[PDB]
């Protein structure tokens, strides 16, 4: 009825009007690269890692923000698409610090993983790097903000999910910095979820700091009992010890967040 | 009335001060039409 037909790599898919080019690719099984897009946050379109070619169109479109149109053929593996990804990944890593050994995100980092899969294998950056000062937003979330990639997921989450307008960007240009501006704490019953949505090690768990690595944890899918909601969780263990608690997506209960008492 | 094209007639702005712009906006308010309303006092309302 109201469905429109679009093609993903020449393959027909029927989508509701208003579907984004990124969501059309989901239905054929293709996951577009992303950093700023989150399905449970508002669309931003600032990282530019989802840029994709549309056949017979000269300029690439941001897949996360662009609605599809009837008859569009999305080329996700095209030469124009792949070169867009290498360029953007090249910019994202230009000022990123060489911290992977000392960074808790190492081994479960979307910057590391998407660099391996869609980025170049080497650097041609021959300049100095940006160093940003760190900000104390409380006892539960550690900030190494030199690692931030300015996706504003923390900002959009804190505004829209947690109903707290304390995070924002200050300055502009290469010196635009995420934070609170003043010395303030982002203490909320849901504050600890910015750790998960931060795709990099800019925001990490202080209690969990330095203890383990992602590859060595055993995952046990269990239930939270700190309240009567019944949040689905993952218990990470290593050598018979509980290391941390993570949310497990359950749409009809906790979605993909947990409270800080659970975490 | 003479077409004297030899003087700069934009000399008024040399007397403006700190609140010239916002004072004019205050006088202009009596003329504006009623503003439209979205319906709520703010998006947070």
């Amino acid at each position: 009825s109201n469905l429109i037909e679009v093609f993903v790599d020449g393959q027909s898919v029927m989508v509701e009007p208003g579907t984004t080019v990124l969501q059309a690719c989901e239905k054929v099984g293709m996951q577009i690269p992303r950093f700023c897009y989150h399905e449970r946050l508002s669309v931003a379109g600032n990282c530019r890692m989802c840029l994709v070619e549309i056949e017979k169109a000269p300029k690439v479109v941001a897949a996360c923000a662009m609605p599809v149109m009837k008859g569009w053929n999305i080329l996700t593996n095209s030469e124009k698409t792949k070169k867009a990804r290498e360029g953007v990944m090249e910019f994202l890593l230009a000022n990123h610090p060489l911290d992977c050994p000392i960074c808790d995100q190492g081994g479960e980092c979307d910057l590391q993983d998407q660099s391996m899969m869609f980025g170049s294998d080497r650097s041609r950056f021959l300049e100095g790097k940006r160093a940003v000062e760190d900000k104390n937003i409380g006892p539960l979330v550690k900030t190494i903000m030199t690692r931030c990639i300015q996706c504003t997921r923390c900002i959009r989450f804190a505004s829209e999910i947690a109903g707290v307008d304390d995070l924002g960007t200050t300055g502009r240009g290469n010196d635009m910095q995420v934070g609170t501006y003043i010395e303030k704490m982002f203490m909320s019953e849901l504050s600890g979820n910015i750790i998960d949505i931060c795709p990099v090690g800019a925001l990490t768990s202080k209690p969990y700091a330095f203890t383990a690595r992602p590859w060595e944890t055993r995952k046990t899918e269990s239930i939270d009992v700190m309240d009567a909601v019944g949040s689905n969780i993952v218990v990470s263990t290593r050598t018979g010890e509980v290391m941390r608690i993570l949310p497990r997506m359950h749409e009809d209960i906790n979605e993909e967040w947990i409270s800080d008492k659970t975490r | 009335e003479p077409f004297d094209n030899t003087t700069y007639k934009n000399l008024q702005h040399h007397d403006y001060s700190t609140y010239t712009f916002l004072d004019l906006n205050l006088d202009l308010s009596k003329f504006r039409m009623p503003q439209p309303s979205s319906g709520r006092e703010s998006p947070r309302h």
Binding site: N46, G87, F91, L92, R172, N174 | N5, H13, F31
Partner: protein, 432 residues
């Protein structure tokens, strides 16, 4: 009688008859010069007639991109939904080398205030916000005085110009940001947020300022609309080449004898413009190194191209550049072209909003590279690296500021590559 040589505009056909501030900018004189004349009769013919007049004139946007104004204004001309409609007048005026809008606002303020009313009536808007940069304080106050004079005379407000159409003109001032000249980033600044451009879609004629249908138009594009409706759509198209019609304001600056603002016909040869109105290049036409034909964003062109280049949208596109704002920047052979363009990259680095990755990181990167080329502290291989770094910024950003930082670099590499490499040898020899 298709005209073949364009230029030599006569003062009868000029629009900004008070461009130089030698008459009375207040309402009394402006009415003596033909402003606010039969504005009622214009507004009673309706939104269709006015738009057709603009479409016929071949008027294209005077703010940089250069889009056909009549077609652009026609998107607003649609049935309402319940939301107000607005006209945003882009008086940010921040493109380096560009200062045409400054003169309109302070010396022909009533040409703008009428264009807001005529343009607003064409699109069906209820009011016009005029965004003006916060540095232009004296110009903003002159504009406020003119808007008061028009209000007291019944020309704008309830039953404007004795027509039954209600219209307000608001003047809002910025706070320092070249990026607020970008049409969506302007809208965001009027809403009280950081001037960060929006992605499109949705287009402003769907969801604009306050979430309402909106057209953003340049000061010069709006300030000539009442005249095109008066003297006619066909009269305007009789100037300039086909598809590049009208008379244009020109800023000549740099290494000319007499830097000046002037109005001249479109398609005027660039050599004629510099010699005739600006007094020619400092030291004669043989001292000319390169010319930036329309503000910082446009690529430079070398002296060989300047000989026979016509100043219109299509001619300058052939030369791998653009008319842009028509801000002509002149550099003579004493100029350091590398240092000249490196300072533009330092400007774009300072004006990027920081929102999106290719410009937040890419423009700052190109700035660091262009700084070393100035001292020669590089290798010839980095030049093709800098070329590819720019091509990754271009077309991959949210707004066109990212484009505007790549094009200056590409122009320097395109026409002065030997100059870049030559400096690298000297640095190597000294440090050997």
């Amino acid at each position: 009688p298709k005209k073949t040589s364009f230029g030599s505009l006569k003062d009868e056909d000029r629009i900004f008859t008070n461009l130089y501030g030698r008459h009375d900018w207040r309402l009394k004189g402006a009415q003596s010069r033909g402003d606010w004349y039969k504005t009622k009769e214009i507004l009673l013919k309706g939104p269709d007639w006015i738009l057709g007049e603009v479409k016929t004139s071949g008027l294209r946007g005077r703010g940089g991109a250069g889009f056909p104004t009549g077609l652009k204004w026609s998107f607003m001309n649609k049935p309402s939904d319940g939301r107000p409609k607005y006209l945003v007048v882009n008086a940010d005026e921040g493109e380096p080398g560009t200062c045409k809008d400054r003169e309109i606002i302070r010396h022909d303020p009533h040409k703008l205030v009428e264009g807001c009313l005529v343009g607003g009536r064409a699109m069906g808007a209820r009011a016009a916000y005029i965004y003006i940069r916060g540095e232009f304080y004296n110009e903003a106050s002159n504009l406020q005085v003119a808007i008061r004079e028009a209000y007291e005379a019944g020309l704008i407000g309830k039953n404007a110009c004795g027509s039954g159409y209600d219209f307000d003109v608001f003047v809002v001032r910025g706070a320092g940001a070249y990026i607020c000249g970008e049409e969506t980033a302007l809208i965001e600044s009027i809403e009280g947020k950081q001037g960060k451009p929006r992605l499109k879609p949705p287009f402003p004629a769907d969801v604009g300022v306050f979430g309402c249908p909106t057209t953003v138009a340049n000061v010069e594009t709006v300030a000539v609309s009442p005249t095109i409706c008066r003297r006619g759509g066909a009269w305007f198209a009789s100037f300039g080449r086909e598809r590049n019609s009208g008379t244009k304001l020109f800023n000549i600056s740099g290494h000319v004898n007499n830097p000046c603002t002037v109005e001249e016909e479109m398609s005027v040869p660039l050599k004629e413009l510099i010699e005739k109105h600006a007094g020619g290049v400092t030291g004669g036409w043989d001292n000319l190194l390169a010319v930036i034909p329309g503000g910082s964003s446009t690529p430079l062109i070398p002296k060989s191209v300047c000989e026979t280049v016509l100043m219109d949208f299509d001619a300058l596109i052939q030369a791998q550049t653009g008319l842009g704002t028509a801000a002509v920047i002149v550099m003579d052979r004493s100029t350091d072209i590398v240092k000249a363009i490196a300072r533009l990259i330092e400007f774009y680095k300072h004006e990027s909003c920081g929102q999106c990755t290719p410009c937040r990181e890419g423009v700052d990167w190109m700035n660091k590279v262009m700084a070393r080329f100035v001292r020669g502290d590089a290798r010839p291989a980095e030049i093709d690296s800098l070329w590819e770094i720019s091509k990754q910024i271009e077309g991959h950003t949210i707004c066109a500021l990212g484009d505007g930082a790549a094009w200056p670099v590409q122009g320097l590499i395109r026409h002065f590559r030997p100059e870049l490499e030559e400096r690298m040898q000297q640095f190597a020899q000294q440090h050997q």
